[PDB]
Amino acid sequence: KVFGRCELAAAMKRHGLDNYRGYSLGNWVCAAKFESNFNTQATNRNTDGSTDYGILQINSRWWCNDGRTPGSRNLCNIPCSALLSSDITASVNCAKKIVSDGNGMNAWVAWRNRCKGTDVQAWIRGCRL
């Protein structure tokens, strides 16, 4: 599913992301935009052989099982296919683990390069929240 901006904000808020580990809701929407274009089915293969999946481009080396990533962990205890669904639950609950890990939202490179330090409340402006 390709979300609308405010539709995703609302969904993110419903799953408890607004101010999760202190990151305002706009940070999460911004990260989603630039990681996936709001497209739950987004997949991208990396040079190391891991793949990143879903709206929040969660990585196979550490967080989900895809069967083709050697020596990898599955720290979210999910098949990576769970991360492509129109229901964002598994993506959100895995992302809560990731942001907890110690580097905060810096884990999402596109957050660090395109959202960190910017006016991220613009991402939620206009929405009925």
Total residues belonging to the chain: 129
Binding region for Na ion (CB under 5 A) out of 32-40, 69-77, 91-99, 105-113:
69-77
- Annotated active-site residue 7? The verdict is no
Q: Of residues 7, 18, 35, 66, which has the active-site annotation?
A: 35
Q: Is 66 annotated as a binding residue?
A: no
C-alpha 60/C-alpha 62 separation (Å) is 5
Residue 63, number of CB atoms within 10 A of its CB = 25
Q: Which of 36, 59, 60, 91 lies at the binding interface for Na ion (CB under 5 A)?
A: 60
Binding mask 73-102 for Na ion (x = CB under 5 A): -x----------------------------
Helix intervals (H) in the chain: 5-14, 25-36, 89-100, 109-114
Provide the residue type at 107 as one letter: A
Q: Is 59 in the site for Na ion (CB under 5 A)?
A: no
Name the binding residues for substrate: 101
**Residues involved in catalysis:** 35, 52
